[PDB]
Symmetry: C3
Subunit: 219 residues, 3 copies
Amino acid sequence: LALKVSPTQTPLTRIISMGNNLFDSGYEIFASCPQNKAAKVAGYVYLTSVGGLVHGTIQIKATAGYWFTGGNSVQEIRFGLVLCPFSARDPTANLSGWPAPVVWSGDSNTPLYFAANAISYTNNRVNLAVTGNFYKEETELPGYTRHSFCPTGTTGMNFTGGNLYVCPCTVNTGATTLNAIYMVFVITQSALGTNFFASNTPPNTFFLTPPIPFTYVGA
Amino acid sequence: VSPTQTPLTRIISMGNNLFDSGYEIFASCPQNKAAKVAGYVYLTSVGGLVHGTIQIKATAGYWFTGGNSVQESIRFGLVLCPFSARDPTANLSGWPAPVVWSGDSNTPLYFAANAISYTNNRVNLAVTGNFYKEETELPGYTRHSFCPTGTTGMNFTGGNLYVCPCTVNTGATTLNAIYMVFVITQSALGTNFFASNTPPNTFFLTPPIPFTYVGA
Amino acid sequence: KVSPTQTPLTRIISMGNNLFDSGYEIFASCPQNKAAKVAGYVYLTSVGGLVHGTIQIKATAGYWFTGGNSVQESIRFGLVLCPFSARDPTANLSGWPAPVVWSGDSNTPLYFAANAISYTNNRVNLAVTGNFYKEETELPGYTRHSFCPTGTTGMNFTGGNLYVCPCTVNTGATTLNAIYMVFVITQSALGTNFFASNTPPNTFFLTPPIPFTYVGA
């Protein structure tokens, strides 16, 4: 029980993470891409819940070998991911196939604190298809916040910038009322960067974002 | 016992997150014009920094009439005054008193913008209807990019929140409220939000836009 | 009852002087093998493994180099933040004073080194020898945070961008990750030439506090 100030008059910083920060476990995370293509990538997501706001970072690593083939990245690199911190209760929303979260602070209930707030996103969340073309361009989201960054990668990629667009989402045929988070990444290259999507690009060509920080309202 | 200074995460909130109270928040606009919007602010103080989000809903009928919202963008200014009970003249937008979700009753004073750190990075605002200041005239700002949703023909293409603490001339304190100017842009095919023939229930609604400033 | 061990505590350190009444003793690396002395105040909180900081830089034309044109080139400078400078002075390339702990024990500045695992392939190696400026287009990945500074009346600033990327200096005693930060500040054509010898040396710019976040130790 309480002290000179009660331990729930005090908000507890909670922590969960998803994926593998060592990027030594392959590329088994599903990303949907424009025009009904897809990619498998690697990722690490670190989320803290403090005061009802979620502050997190997302870090994505990809290879051309596990990317689709055809088209031109330089002229066209865009991909969509879903974060489902409550995938244990709602497996069908885990569209990107993240592992279970790993709770570093809080109950086994803690994942539920990282669904996107129900009141404030009621009319700022996209409905997603359950199939492999659930990709939504950021101009189709009902609202988003934008986070600017730049990845690194193989030498001739010649990246010029990057943007992360966060928008909560719901999947058409779920088992719970909860909001997941949709994230579409747009990454650009100068005119002479190598065509990530080309068939004459060796498979070990890679890009790797830093951890990208973002914030949304928690549950 | 050792937690003398274990920093306490304090929480206040402004406005109505259900957006079911009409549009009574006051926003200053270019050319000595105004709008009435709705909004919800959620402010956290941790370790001396305030991490908050703000969400605005607005309708064309509660916006001024005249001009072209595609050539001009949609531009409006808001004042967050978490210390408005002690300093009502500085609540230029007319927000209700904040609600304390975590902390004492003094907690709103934490969300005043740090006195030392904005001494020369704060704007002095008019007490009158055209308090609008364009972000190019702010003595410093941070920028936070977003996009709102809205009615179908709006064709929004981006937004930016510009954050810079502020002060009101005839105020009752030396404290720093927070001034916020929004700029929402549309493509060449978008509805004129400012037209008299635009349906009055045509609306935009930002997501919660996250921002951070140095707290008190 | 509720253990102070089982609950992540908010730790706070700070570097520099938030009053800007101690001069301009901070070393800022600049393009074209040039440099500048500036003033700074960094406020860092560590909350659950992520660092949420702000940085504010004050600079005068007098303590900036001379030569060039600040409207054509922009105003660009890199700093290093080294909260572990006490244990690794080799890494304190900008020469900040030691941090001041506002929340935590004396070992707390180490929690503000950038995450070893998460930045292993996203960290720039800064020159061991001499000037270390790195254009943001040459960092192995960054995060960008847009602002606009104020300054004296003719500067005509049009925008600002802080590019955050952790760094190592190889000759360091530790393997710890400091923070490299390059600032790019833009001016319209009307703007005072910050680099010119005609410019009153007290001509200045002052950024607001710029909020940024990286993964902690």
